[PDB]
Design an enzyme around this catalytic site. Sequence first.
Site, mmCIF file in Angstrom:
data_model
loop_
_atom_site.group_PDB
_atom_site.id
_atom_site.type_symbol
_atom_site.label_atom_id
_atom_site.label_comp_id
_atom_site.label_asym_id
_atom_site.label_seq_id
_atom_site.Cartn_x
_atom_site.Cartn_y
_atom_site.Cartn_z
ATOM 1 N N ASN A 6 0.994 -1.114 -0.150
ATOM 2 C CA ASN A 6 -0.051 -0.059 0.070
ATOM 3 C C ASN A 6 0.920 1.199 0.102
ATOM 4 O OD1 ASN A 6 -1.273 -2.045 2.539
ATOM 5 N ND2 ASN A 6 -2.615 -1.523 0.722
ATOM 6 N N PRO A 7 0.969 1.934 -1.011
ATOM 7 C CA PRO A 7 1.753 3.291 -1.237
ATOM 8 C C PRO A 7 1.135 4.215 -0.396
ATOM 9 C CG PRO A 7 0.440 3.009 -3.107
ATOM 10 C CD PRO A 7 0.096 1.623 -2.165
ATOM 11 N N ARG A 8 0.825 4.377 0.802
ATOM 12 C CA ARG A 8 -0.045 5.455 1.610
ATOM 13 C C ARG A 8 0.093 5.217 2.869
ATOM 14 N NH1 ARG A 8 -5.431 1.907 1.134
ATOM 15 N NH2 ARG A 8 -4.660 1.201 2.929
ATOM 16 N N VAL A 9 -0.392 6.102 3.883
ATOM 17 C CA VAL A 9 -0.418 6.008 5.211
ATOM 18 C C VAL A 9 -1.508 4.936 5.314
ATOM 19 C CG1 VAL A 9 -0.370 7.293 7.362
ATOM 20 C CG2 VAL A 9 -0.497 8.351 5.079
ATOM 21 N N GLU C 91 -4.317 6.487 -3.913
ATOM 22 C CA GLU C 91 -3.283 5.426 -4.691
ATOM 23 C C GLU C 91 -3.880 5.696 -6.253
ATOM 24 O OE1 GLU C 91 -4.939 1.863 -3.019
ATOM 25 O OE2 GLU C 91 -3.476 1.558 -1.514
#
Lengths: 96, 96, 96
Positions: A6-9, C91
């Site tokens: 997951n490229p996020r907080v 995303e």
Amino acid sequence: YFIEVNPRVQVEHTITEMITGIDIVQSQLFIADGYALHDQLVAIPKQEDIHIHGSAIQSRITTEDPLNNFMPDTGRVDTYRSTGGFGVRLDAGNGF
Amino acid sequence: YFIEVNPRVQVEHTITEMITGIDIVQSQLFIADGYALHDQLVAIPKQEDIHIHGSAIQSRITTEDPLNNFMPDTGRVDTYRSTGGFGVRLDAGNGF
Amino acid sequence: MMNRIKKVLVANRGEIAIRVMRACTELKIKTVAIYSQEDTGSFHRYKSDEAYLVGAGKKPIDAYLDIENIIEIAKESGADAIHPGYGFLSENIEFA
């Protein structure tokens, strides 16, 4: 076995800040401004100096009614009284 | 130079629980029940293993009016909305 | 305290929106919230220094996905940076 990135907080980043001491969301900001993890302002220790302190649990309080198949309830919240004391953290959504 | 012993909990014990990890008020209870600091339930480390983690600050929010010589205001509190997020602790008196 | 980032627009709602805002204010960064029509009363709107309606006319969820409206508002308000939060557009390739 790897399964995903997951490229996020994430929602549960909270529990990590609690055991490591590192403000993840400030870190995000610092990074994007242009700084480097260990710049004294950003204060992220070296990998060797990052440690686990204690353990933390997160519970998400939602209007999902367990007596109705977890269907989200709606309406005005007439009373909302959270809690406090040592070892407690609250991150409020639309519960006020 | 020594000046005083308070044989009780203090208002600021909070900030100590925060940097050491040790629930002081539970400890009090455990002690008086009859246990010993290190009994695994009470979980107080040995002096060598008690450490400082980070730093903590306490501010006491009161109805003392600074624009009126710190005289305590009175009345109904119509709005009271505290705060949250990482690194924040609240211990409520008669502010609800 | 910050190099390039003087103002952040938080392109989300709810809990994570408030978290980001709180991290921004800690770093002395100005915050800009967005709300859908439906969220005109969400309390995250009251946690930012500025707030602006987004998605005018779109459905509830689509309104927080309106990339170009979000960019308009970002620019209009002088936002050096956008924190997309989690979910929604966090995303989304086109948005980054």
